[PDB]
């Protein structure tokens, strides 16, 4: 049963980062700068993702390399 909760926590971990946004107390000009901060968040996110991707690639090579070692000292 804990594994089902683990999948639920995976969705819950995605859920935690999102929070309610309020557009009623803001005026016309402020909303624009606030939109920009949302945009920078987007930017930031992709950057880390990109990093991970590149690391993933690197890590895969590692795996390959590692496999060869067990195929040379067996």
């Amino acid at each position: 049963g804990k594994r089902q909760t683990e999948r639920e926590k995976k969705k819950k971990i995605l859920a935690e980062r999102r929070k309610v946004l309020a557009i009623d107390h803001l005026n016309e000009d402020q909303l624009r700068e606030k939109a920009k901060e949302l945009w920078q968040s987007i930017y930031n996110l992709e950057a880390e993702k990109f990093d991970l991707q590149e690391k993933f690639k690197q890590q895969k090579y590692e795996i390959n390399v590692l496999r060869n070692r067990i195929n040379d000292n067996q």
């Binding site: 594994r3 089902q4 999948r7």
Partner: protein, 375 residues
């Protein structure tokens, strides 16, 4: 490694996991169903921090790791061990991801609904699998046998299933499961060896004596007569050499160990022996097909690798049933892998490629509806 988009046949039988690609005639990755867990805590530095051993990695070290059985009588006890054994089979032996090919798993007859829903959920949500399918072992074994009639006797490690199939027709009402198999035989041999004088109370020795049984223990053709002639032993008792070197001497106990199957009273249970339960099952069937069930009985399971089971079955059934008809018992060679073999020949059909269950329909329907669709 694999250039054909075909389902991976992974028979997760109790006691031995047999995994391999479809189309092959034998499983390539064969390892016992055991999970070794680090017992103590070491101050050492450099060893693998891995907190959960599995398969041959656990078999190689049974003195340090406390051994836990991932399956008991049929009901799945721990699901972490399930995730461990599949993740291991996927990313340590087969060297292939489940995101590229289907997976035809084989489950035991008359299993809990919780077990099925749990494995299906781990195979859909956690792991990204394009399609799953649960199959009963008896049908695939009858396929590998190359027939459509007979009663399959599948004796695994902790459960024994008798499944009658006549003229290609399953009988879900007559399938009766009984938790008498290799573990209760290992326990009986252990207690009688403790009675002999060599006493042990740890699981590693239990697995060792299990292997000793698999290698030496056989079925008797006449229990009482062998008891009498073994009272004065000469060639009836054998001296086995333990892999460690200790000289063990085992005599009659061998052919009295599987006898517990024929006399469950030894373990104080009112259940009937495997032969008598099969006979009762035959009465529960219709008379018209009973002769065909007598002439086409098939066996399955690793426990059937002992020498002398066919003859014992023939004498017992002849003593129970009339001796006017013909009652031939057929045991195909390498019956243990036959089930898995069936899986292979079942995954190559295009129609079977049309009977899979994709992720999306399962997600909307939910696991319970999936249970209705299969049966």
């Amino acid at each position: 490694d694999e250039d054909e988009t075909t389902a991976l046949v992974c028979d997760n039988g109790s006691g031995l996991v047999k995994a391999g690609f479809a189309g092959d005639d034998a499983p390539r990755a064969v390892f016992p169903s055991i999970v070794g867990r680090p017992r103590h805590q070491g101050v050492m530095v450099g060893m693998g921090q891995k907190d959960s051993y599995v398969g041959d990695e656990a078999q190689s070290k049974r003195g340090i790791l406390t051994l836990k059985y991932p399956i008991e009588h049929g009901i799945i006890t721990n699901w972490d061990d399930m995730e461990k054994i599949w993740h291991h089979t996927f990313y340590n032996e087969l060297r292939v991801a489940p995101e590229e090919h289907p997976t035809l798993l084989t489950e035991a007859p008359l299993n809990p609904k919780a077990n099925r829903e749990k494995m299906t959920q781990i195979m859909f949500e956690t792991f990204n699998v394009p399609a799953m399918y649960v199959a009963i072992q008896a049908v695939l074994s009858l396929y590998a046998s190359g027939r459509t009639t007979g009663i399959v006797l599948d004796s695994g490690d902790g459960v024994t299933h008798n499944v009658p199939i006549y003229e290609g027709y399953a009988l879900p009402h007559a399938i009766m499961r009984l938790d008498l198999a290799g573990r209760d035989l290992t326990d009986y041999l252990m207690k009688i060896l403790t009675e002999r004088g060599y006493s042990f109370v740890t699981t590693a020795e239990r697995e060792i004596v299990r292997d000793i049984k698999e290698k030496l223990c056989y079925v008797a053709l006449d229990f009482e007569n062998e008891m009498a002639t073994a009272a004065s032993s000469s060639s009836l008792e054998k001296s086995y050499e333990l892999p460690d070197g200790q000289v063990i001497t085992i005599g009659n106990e061998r052919f009295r160990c599987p006898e517990t199957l024929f006399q469950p009273s030894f373990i104080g249970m009112e259940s009937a022996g495997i032969h008598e339960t099969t006979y009762n099952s035959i009465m529960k069937c219709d008379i018209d097909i009973r002769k065909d069930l007598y002439a086409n009985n098939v066996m399955s399971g690793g426990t059937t690798m002992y020498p002398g089971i066919a003859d014992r079955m023939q004498k017992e059934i002849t003593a129970l049933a009339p001796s006017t008809m013909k009652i031939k018992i057929i045991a195909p060679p390498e019956r243990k892998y036959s089930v898995w073999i069936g899986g292979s020949i079942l995954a190559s059909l295009s129609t079977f490629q049309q009977m899979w269950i994709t992720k999306q329909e399962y997600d909307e329907a939910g696991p319970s509806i999936v249970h209705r669709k299969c049966f």
